[PDB]
């Protein structure tokens, strides 16, 4: 269906230990493809995906030049922020950055994202209309006023629509084997007594891609979200994902419950009963 490509940048200062640490990773949907690390001896963008290893060195040299430009941008961004907020240099502070684009099923542009976060909170970000900036505090309004006057919103908009999309288009071709596939989950239930009057029902979803999924419990067709424990979706490590939800039930009322799974790779959603 629709597809997404994102780059995630994380910079962290380490005051006594010298230069900040910069870590950036590429993603297409939930599949990672490249990475870059400040402390890595390679000092080059490295492929984390097998279908992107085929790219020529002209490509790698170009990408690794831009990611280094961003790394030092964020290192100075950190210095500006410690000045802006007047935090002492003894403290270690974090700047996260994300940008990317989305496309439709046919491949036309959908949305775009250019944003930063300082110490886990939103600092600045680009509005969906891609002509404006959202700036939380009065420190970000300075950078906003800086980036409005420098016409930054227009240049990234040209990138996001022109360059971000066209790369995503070739990647979705290059990786047609892996990327464009959809793996239906393999599901089942497990039953785990605790007391003699209670038992635990767990509904599993295994080996599915993409990771977006909806797990649900019900009783007699009515929704049980009261007693539900539901874990965060976890990567399997092979490229697929896993998740489960669970409810504690009075024994023996068990088949009075149903589990409901929805995923892109499923033609119809599933219903599991004990």
């Amino acid at each position: 269906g629709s597809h997404s490509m994102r780059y995630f940048s994380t910079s962290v200062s380490r005051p006594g230990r010298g230069e900040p640490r910069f870590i950036a990773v590429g993603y297409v949907d939930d599949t990672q493809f490249v990475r870059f690390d400040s402390d890595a001896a390679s000092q080059r963008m490295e492929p984390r995906a097998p279908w992107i290893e085929q790219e020529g060195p002209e490509y790698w040299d170009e990408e690794t030049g831009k990611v280094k430009a961003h790394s030092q941008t964020d290192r100075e961004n950190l210095r500006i922020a410690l000045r802006y907020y007047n935090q002492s240099e003894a403290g270690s502070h974090t700047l996260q950055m994300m940008f990317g684009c989305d496309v439709g099923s046919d491949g036309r542009f959908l949305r775009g994202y250019h944003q930063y976060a300082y110490d886990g909170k939103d600092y600045i970000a680009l509005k969906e209309d891609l002509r404006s900036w959202t700036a939380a505090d009065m420190a970000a309004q300075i950078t906003k006023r800086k980036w409005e006057a420098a016409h930054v919103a227009e240049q990234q908009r040209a990138y996001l629509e022109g360059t971000c999309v066209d790369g995503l288009r070739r990647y979705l071709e290059n990786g047609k084997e892996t990327l464009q596939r959809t793996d239906p989950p393999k599901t089942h239930m497990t039953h785990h007594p605790i007391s003699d009057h209670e038992a635990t029902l767990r509904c599993w979803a295994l080996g599915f891609y993409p990771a977006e999924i909806t797990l649900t419990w019900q009783r007699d067709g009515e929704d049980q979200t009261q007693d539900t424990e539901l874990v965060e979706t976890r990567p399997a490590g092979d490229g697929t994902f896993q998740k489960w939800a669970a409810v504690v039930v009075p024994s023996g009322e068990e088949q009075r419950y149903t589990c409901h799974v929805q995923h892109e790779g499923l033609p119809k959603p599933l219903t599991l009963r004990w």
Binding site: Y7, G26, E63, A69, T73
Partner: peptide
Amino acid sequence: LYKKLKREMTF
């Protein structure tokens, strides 16, 4: 394909 701002802009 990574972002490149022609003149790199900081806060």
